[PDB]
Each structure stands twice: as C-alpha cells, then as structure tokens.
Design a protein around this nucleic acid. Structure first.
Ligand code: MG
Ligand code: MG
Ligand code: MG
Ligand code: MG
Ligand code: MG
Ligand code: MG
Ligand code: MG
Ligand code: MG
Ligand code: MG
Ligand code: MG
Ligand code: MG
Ligand code: MG
Ligand code: MG
Ligand code: MG
Ligand code: MG
Ligand code: MG
Ligand code: MG
Ligand code: MG
Ligand code: MG
Ligand code: MG
Ligand code: MG
Ligand code: MG
Ligand code: MG
Ligand code: MG
Ligand code: MG
Ligand code: MG
Ligand code: MG
Ligand code: MG
Ligand code: MG
Ligand code: MG
Ligand code: MG
Ligand code: MG
Ligand code: MG
Ligand code: MG
Ligand code: MG
Ligand code: MG
Ligand code: MG
Lengths: 77, 149
RNA sequence: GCUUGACUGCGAGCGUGACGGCGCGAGCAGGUGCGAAAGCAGGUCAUAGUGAUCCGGUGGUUCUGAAUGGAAGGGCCAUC
RNA sequence: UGAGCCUUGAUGUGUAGGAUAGGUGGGAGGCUUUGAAGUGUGGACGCCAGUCUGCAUGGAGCCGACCUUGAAAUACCACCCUUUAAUGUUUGAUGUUCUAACGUUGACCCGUAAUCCGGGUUGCGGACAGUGUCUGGUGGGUAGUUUGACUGGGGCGGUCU
RNA sequence: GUUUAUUAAAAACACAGCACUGUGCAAACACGAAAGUGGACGUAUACGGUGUGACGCCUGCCCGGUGCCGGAAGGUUAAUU
RNA sequence: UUUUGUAUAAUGGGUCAGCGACUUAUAUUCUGUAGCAAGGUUAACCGAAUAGGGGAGCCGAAGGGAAACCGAGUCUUAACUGGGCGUUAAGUUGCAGGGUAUAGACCCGAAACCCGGUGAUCUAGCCAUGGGCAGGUUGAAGGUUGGGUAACACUAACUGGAGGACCGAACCGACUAAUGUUGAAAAAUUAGCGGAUGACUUGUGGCUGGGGGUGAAAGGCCAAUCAAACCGGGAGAUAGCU
RNA sequence: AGGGUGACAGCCCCGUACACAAAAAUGCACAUGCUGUGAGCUCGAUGAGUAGGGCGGGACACGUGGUAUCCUGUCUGAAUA
RNA sequence: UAAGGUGAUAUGAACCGUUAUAACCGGCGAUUUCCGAAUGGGGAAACCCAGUGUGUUUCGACACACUAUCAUUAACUGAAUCCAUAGGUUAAUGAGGCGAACCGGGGGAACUGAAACAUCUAAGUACCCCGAGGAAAAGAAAUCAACCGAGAUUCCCCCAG
C-alpha cells in the first residue's frame, strides 16, 4: 500500500474544486519512492518504501536512528 | 546539508569540514560508501571531542619529548674513546650503534634509531656536533669529543 | 439680456396603487437667479425615455472599530 | 555561462597645477637582493593625454609639503566613495561527459528441483525516463442538469416592460 | 452463414475482399487506483482501430468550413518567480 | 367523486364482517380560562422529591436612532413654524384550544436516484474435456496412361476422393397457414418449411457481474424481468397530481 | 403486594411484611504472601523537519471573505527563557 | 430439599424411592462423537486420505495422542560470499473466530430542499472497513478572559435561533 515506511503517511482524501465551485472526491498522494540506502551498521543496503519528506527527515535525523525506531515499531527489513 | 566528510573528495573534503551541500552525492552514494557521515547535532560535536581529545593529548606530548632533547642539551659534551692512530686517524669507527650505549649510560637513555648524523661516521677524532630526530622539529645540538686512548 | 431654482433641507394636504412603489403640492428655512418692484424660478406644455434586492467600486463622515490605540471591515451620505 | 559575492587592488585629465591630486581620518618619508628604478613587451583605463598590471630583462636604488593648490601627492599606513575586475564560491541559462540514485519485461549465483520474488553478480540505459504535488490545453469517455410562459389543443409564427 | 428466446429472418448483421490509420515490442490497444494480465510465448507477410463489402469496369472536381497531420520563426499565453 | 354542469352512456364500490386516514413533540402567536400583578416566572438541578429549595435566565414596566448617543422623548436638519416614530390604554406564567414553524406532519400511490449485497443451473461470448451427423448424389487437386511437344504446354482416358458442394432422417433451426388465444402449453400443436462434414450440433465443468458484463448488432441476452437485472437497505425518497 | 382455588377469599393454598440460612464457586471492597512495578531526594532536563511560510484540499456555526484559528498531500523552514 | 420420582406430546411398560445414594433445586468437577475459526492435509460443511509415537501373552490394519498459519523470544542448523546475513527445524507463549447496542477511527452516497438547478441543502447522514472497552472517547491550557479575573476534561440549563 502507498504507506511511507518511514512516517506512516498515506493517501488522503479531499476535493477537486472547480471554478463554478463544484466539489469532487479525490486523492492526494505522496511522491513516495522505493529508494535504497547504505548501512555500515548492518553491512547490507536494504531498500524501503519512503515519502517525499520520507527522506528529508532521515537526512536531518540519523539514517540509523530510524531502523531502530522501526525495530521497536515491530517490522522486518 | 551539513554531512561531514572523511577523505579528500574533489575540491575539498579537508578531512573534517562541515558543509552546505546537496542531498545527492550524499545519502544517494557518497555517504553510502564510507566517505562522510550524517552531520547530526550529535556527530557535529562527536568529532569535536576528537579534535579536542587527540589535540591537547598526543599532540603536546611532543613536549614530553622536546625537553629530552634539552635533557641532552644540559650535557653539551660526552666523550667516547676507542683507539686512534697518531695524528687522529682512529682505526675502526665511531658507530651509530656505539653512540647508543655511550649515552645510554650518560643519562638520556636512547636506542639506535634516533641518532641522526652527517656522514657515515666515524673515523676522524676531536669535535663533532649532532642533530637528532627525537620527534619532528626542534632537533638537539649534541657534541661528542672522541678521545684516543 | 442677464443669468444656473435642472438649487440643499423640509413639507399641511392630496392623488394612485394588493404591495414594493409612483405622482401633484402651497407653504418653512438656508441660500440664489432675474424684476425697480407685485412677483416668478426646486428643470423642459402635460403625460413614454426604464431595472427591485443582492454583491462589489469611488468619495464623504470616528457613527462602528472584537484586550487598548490604530487599522481592516461594517454602518450611515452621494454614488457608480 | 548570467547574476549574488566576501577579500583584492584598483580609478577621479575642474581652472592653474611634475597632470586623468578620490573624498577624507592618518601624513615625512615608507618600500627596497622575500634583488629597486631603467628599459622590452603583454594587456588594462583613453577627454590620443596618461594611469593600472603580468612577465622577462635589469641591478643599488625609486617617491615631498614643495613653489603652485579650495584638497597637494598615488610616499606608505587607516576606513571607503564612485568606477570595477579577480580567484573562492553560490546558483540560474545552454551544450559535454560521467555512475552511485532511479529504471532494466538481457546475462548468471543463491535461498531452490520454483519462468514468482528477494538477495548477489554482470550488461544496458541513466539523472533522462518514471511516480508525486502543483499547473495551461484537451477532454460526450463519464457524470449532474438546464433547454421559459402565454397560446381559441401543441407546435410554428407572433407577443412579454 | 447471423439476428430482434416470445408479432420483424430482412434489402438488416457477419463474410472473404479493399482502403485508410495506429503500432519497433516493456508495442499500439484493452481490463485493473495498482500489482499484475490479455495483445502473444505473437513481433510489421505481425497486431489493433475506422469505414467499404465477392468478382467485373471503376471511384471525377472542392481543404473555403469542421476534424485531423505537420512546421516551430513570431504574437498571445498557467503554476512559479 | 369531480364539475359551469351529471339519471348520466363520466369516476369508485360484488356483499358482509373487522382495521384504515388531520397525529405527536417542540417552538411560536391569537382566543378562552385560571393565579399573581408593575410585576410575572422559573430553567436544568438539589430534594425530605408532584411539596420546598434553585430567580441563571426569559417576558414587561421606554422609547427614538443605522450607530455613538439622547430619552418622555428621540430621529430628522445647520435648524424647523416642522415632520416620522414615541409618551398617554398591564403585564406575565400556566391550562384548553384556533393558527403557524420545524419535523414522514392528514392517509394511501409513483417512474426514478443512491449504497451494499445475490446471481452465467436461462441466456450471450469464451475455455477445457468427452460425445453426434441413417441413406443417396455431384466428382475439384493429385496420380497413371495413350496422344502431343525439341522439352513444356495442352490432351484423353482411367484412377483418385476435394467442398462453410447437392438431395435428404436423426440432430439443430423457425419462413407460411390454420388451430389454440379463461390453451394440452405464460410462444405450443399440426400440415408444410431452412441448415444438416460446418462459421455444425450436444453433455459435463470452468470463466466473464450491473453504467458492468456478453453481443456475426436487435437495445439483443444477462433465471418467464432489461434504454441499465435481482435482493436488502437510504425509505415514510419526492409527488404544486389523482 | 400479587397469584391459585368449582362465582368475587386479609384468615383454604402459593406468597406477602418481617426475621433468618451456604458445604461449594464466585464478583466488588479492605488486608496480606510471591513475580514485575518504581517510590525518595537532590541537582537536572523542558520533546525541529518541529513551529511558521508558498501551492491544493479539508476541519472550524464562519461558503476566501477584511478571515485570526486548527488538519496536512506538496514544496519549504525558524527561534531555544 | 424431600416424600415421592423414570422432561414434553404422553399413555402404558419395567422400575427408583418413602428418613436419607429415589427424584428435584444449587456450587464444582467428570465425560463431552462428527462438522464448524477447524488448526496434519484435501473438500461439494458434519466427509476422503495421512505422517511421527504407542498399544497387544493378537504387536498386520484398525485403535489412540501430537502435527495449520503467522507475530514474539530462544536454541539449533545455515546461502549466493570470508565474517556474517537471508534461509531453514524445533521449542515456549500469544493471536485467529463468534457477538445486541452504544464508542474512536479509514472510506462515505443519492434521493431530497432551494418550489428548476450547478454553490449551498440533505450530511459527515445512510451504508461499507478497521479497532476497543465497560463504557469508549476526550483531559491536566502553548485555554479563556479584557487590564477585573477565570483555571483539565465529559455532561445538563441558559446566553439564543
Ligand atoms: Mg482587534
Ligand atoms: Mg468605509
Ligand atoms: Mg450526459
Ligand atoms: Mg439534483
Ligand atoms: Mg407550456
Ligand atoms: Mg423473433
Ligand atoms: Mg428470457
Ligand atoms: Mg489489421
Ligand atoms: Mg457494410
Ligand atoms: Mg451495403
Ligand atoms: Mg488537396
Ligand atoms: Mg495542430
Ligand atoms: Mg369535466
Ligand atoms: Mg364547485
Ligand atoms: Mg340534470
Ligand atoms: Mg353508474
Ligand atoms: Mg378521471
Ligand atoms: Mg366500476
Ligand atoms: Mg428577581
Ligand atoms: Mg453452461
Ligand atoms: Mg453440404
Ligand atoms: Mg435440405
Ligand atoms: Mg420468429
Ligand atoms: Mg377450416
Ligand atoms: Mg412442425
Ligand atoms: Mg438505473
Ligand atoms: Mg409518501
Ligand atoms: Mg361460572
Ligand atoms: Mg513539554
Ligand atoms: Mg494553506
Ligand atoms: Mg481436520
Ligand atoms: Mg481441513
Ligand atoms: Mg488429495
Ligand atoms: Mg429540489
Ligand atoms: Mg434522506
Ligand atoms: Mg480512557
Ligand atoms: Mg492573572
């Protein structure tokens, strides 16, 4: 599913609003990608589904801090 | 981005200099190949511990040598003796080796290494200064007067 | 020929409409124009020439102004 | 390859004036074999008058309030002004290549006696493509609706204040 | 040959045949937010879409309109700035 | 019942029995009535609990202006001799009713829109795996042969056995007629009729699902239902109409 | 209270007001053992892709309006008593 | 607790009781086939076929107990590839599924109303999905207020149509 494996994050509904002003159901979506990383920690590369900011955060923060978070949050990779 | 480096890198990578650089080379590959690190607010001062650890310590402990080149300079004349030929010409040689023990028993313990000289000494007797390699810069300035017997 | 009454605030009293409105009006005040003056002049000899409200525009005005001062905005007035 | 730029060192023919004296705080000297003027050029600013500077050549010497002048030496050392280039760099503009992102519905290894997958290797593309958000065009493919009243039936014609 | 099972079997649909047109393959197209399939274990002598309808002789003139293809110089022109 | 109007050949009712259509809550105003009265009256809540507490609060006794504000006045205007609205006639809480509001709002009825299900045991197309086509015709390609060619062509015979070929049962279909038309039957029967080795037919089983499918194309088929299936649900949809 | 009883019962019958009862399991409450739990104090420390902004939407009674406030798909991005 | 009982239609049998093993009420265990979350595998629900162990003075086929999936931790075995890692077997524990309403979330109509209709309405309604408790949710001010003060949240009446 379009789940940004870093920041949960997902598809979010709302409207197209025409000029004449008519609502319409739609989806907003993250630009999310399947980017790869290095990890001198685990001597693998891994590859995880990640958002726009999905990356932006893992840059400010530690590329390694996440795997840890996520290891608590109970998922494999 | 701040990501701090390790090696040279084109242009810069002055071992340890924080940066303003695009997220590409970094994260994408560079960092992903032992070459820099997330310059987090943690790391950013991790190596500051190193800059401020390796410095004052092992650095100025070159002064824990400097003065042993001055211990040397306290006694500005030591004598070694080993047969001469009349008018100077001493048969064998003053040895890079001998000059070890010769000051091994005269205080400044030393081994055959240190001991920098000018020419494949020795042969002629009398007066001879000597610069040393106790570390990097401020050499010694030792002299050895060779008696005959 | 002079001129700007094609004025501003009002308006007893009427007419005409389901209404929303429309119309005729002497006189009151301020101030004009013309007549020397009595007086006349709130547009054209009458009756057609028109578009409610909403929303926004322009100027005027503390009337309003969300802790106070301001301000935005809103009212009111003319006006598009 | 544009502009931002920190440092750089730079320029200013009033009129007379060693003539393209900056304004001005400091101003009698600094610099000088880390070889100086003299030339020899290159280019830099041009009011065809004289400055800036790179390099070589050279080799123990170059500049003074003066006397003129509103300001008087570009003698150095201070902060800067117009006029401005220089790396260093920041990013746009365009073309070039590159490999590690991204792609791979080529090749092989392994889990594995498996035309999935993941992991690995290799070839190929490669910052394109593709996906996001925004954004102009398109859009009976789909969808929701409108499309007036009178009226000698309706329509049509005509009418609507 | 096919069809309105139950008032229409036809001159209607299909047809071989022709033309135009899109597709170089991870093909165009098509089902499906997607993954994945079909097209095809095919590969332009192949595949889809449109019209025309064996065969014979033939298929003139008009690109002004509307659709389309192509051009990329200019005018106009979105977010952004 | 509906109408200008009905014996009306205009609507409804076979008969009887039982049921079946102006409600309920809140809000609001008028009338009646009851209590207090320039007062009237509590709301949730407390509670010994319909009592008594509780006056938050609502209405009224002051109005005029948009408003600031002034006030038996106030607005209007610079001001009105003026003018408009006001002062001079009691209110308020409850009870019952006449209205009105919001609600299925007096009952019953659509055709439809929307959501989630159920169905390819009928039927359309496909897929996979077995089946079926009595009998009688025509006689293509090829082969052989003799002729004929320089050799080919061509040719005759004989063979051979092609075809969405022919006639015509089973098997499929449905052109005409009459019957049936509260049927034998919610599409049949009988006499005829078309295809019958093909784009044939059939058994079993899969697969395609509702703005979807399938369709040699008629809007046809999708369980006797199709210009948008069935079932449940929004749902008492809405009904200026009957 | 109520019900039954051959019709309509305070006094026939079951009950009712009242007063009593649990071998066993049990819920809730208090206390207590065992595993985990940290309490205490002192000195600290005071939650960045986060606020906030550009674009789209949405939630706010408030329909982009003069529209503060909140949520964020997208792009960005502080201060630190 | 007790004089009677072996539930109903519902008799009749052949019996059980009658002072404490008749029956009956209550607590707690016992057994509890086959389906079914169904969990050894397969399936057209209640049926078909297994493997590992064990049983017989009968150790054939039958009998009988364990064997599904993930998450978690552990031990063990362990690739491309050195280490490792993925992979694998096992063990323990947990989960699955069913449920009336209310409750928090993910999605979320249209008929309707506006006397048409698109903004707006219905409406965050109906339905679909997930999840959980006795309630759930919210909750311990980066709140209000208006220069005076208030002091987490949920709830009721007012303010007020
Ligand atoms: Mg304010
Ligand atoms: Mg204004
Ligand atoms: Mg349409
Ligand atoms: Mg509508
Ligand atoms: Mg009409
Ligand atoms: Mg038919
Ligand atoms: Mg049918
Ligand atoms: Mg074709
Ligand atoms: Mg045709
Ligand atoms: Mg034709
Ligand atoms: Mg032409
Ligand atoms: Mg074009
Ligand atoms: Mg009639
Ligand atoms: Mg009548
Ligand atoms: Mg009559
Ligand atoms: Mg009759
Ligand atoms: Mg009728
Ligand atoms: Mg009748
Ligand atoms: Mg009071
Ligand atoms: Mg079938
Ligand atoms: Mg035939
Ligand atoms: Mg026949
Ligand atoms: Mg027929
Ligand atoms: Mg007859
Ligand atoms: Mg027949
Ligand atoms: Mg429909
Ligand atoms: Mg109804
Ligand atoms: Mg009796
Ligand atoms: Mg905090
Ligand atoms: Mg915004
Ligand atoms: Mg089983
Ligand atoms: Mg099973
Ligand atoms: Mg089997
Ligand atoms: Mg409507
Ligand atoms: Mg509704
Ligand atoms: Mg809670
Ligand atoms: Mg305070």
């Amino acid at each position: 599913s379009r789940v940004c494996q870093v920041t949960g994050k997902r598809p979010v509904t709302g409207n197209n609003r025409s000029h004449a002003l008519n609502a319409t159901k739609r989806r907003f979506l993250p630009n999310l990608h399947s980017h790869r990383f290095w990890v001198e920690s685990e001597k693998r590369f891994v590859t995880l589904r990640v958002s726009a900011k999905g990356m932006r955060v893992i840059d400010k923060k530690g590329i390694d801090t996440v795997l840890a978070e996520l290891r608590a949050r109970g998922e494999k990779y | 981005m701040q990501v701090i480096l390790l090696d040279k890198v084109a242009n810069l990578g002055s071992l340890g200099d924080q940066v303003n650089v695009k997220a590409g080379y970094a994260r994408n590959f560079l960092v992903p190949q032992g070459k820099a690190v997330p310059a987090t607010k943690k790391n950013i001062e991790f190596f500051e511990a190193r800059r401020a650890e390796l410095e004052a310590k092992l650095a100025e402990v070159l002064a824990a040598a400097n003065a042993r080149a001055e211990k040397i300079n306290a006694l500005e004349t030591v004598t070694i003796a080993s047969k001469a030929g009349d008018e100077g010409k001493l048969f064998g040689s003053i040895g890079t080796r001998d000059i070890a023990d010769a000051v091994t028993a005269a205080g400044v313990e030393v081994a055959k290494s240190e001991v920098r000289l000018p020419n494949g000494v020795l042969r002629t007797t009398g007066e001879h200064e000597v610069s040393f390699q106790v570390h990097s810069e401020v050499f010694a300035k030792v002299i050895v007067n060779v008696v005959a017997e």
